[PDB]
């Protein structure tokens, strides 16, 4: 999975925590 700051999709299902809809970085 990814770290915060990694770039995500609202639900990439690739962030170890979630995404940040206002950066599009993992939360």
UniProtKB/Swiss-Prot annotation:
PTM-bearing positions, type Tyrosine amide: 27
Paired cysteines (S-S): 1-16, 8-19, 15-26
Consequence of substituting residue 17 to A: Decrease in potency, but not in affinity
Top-level taxon: Eukaryota
Entry-annotated residues carrying 4-hydroxyproline: 4, 10, 21
Its job: Omega-conotoxins act at presynaptic membranes, they bind and block voltage-gated calcium channels (Cav). This toxin blocks N-type calcium channels (Cav2.2/CACNA1B) with a high potency (it displaces [125I]GVIA with an IC(50)=3.7-38 pM).
Name under which the protein is recorded: Omega-conotoxin GVIA
Whole sequence portion shown: 46 to 72 of 73
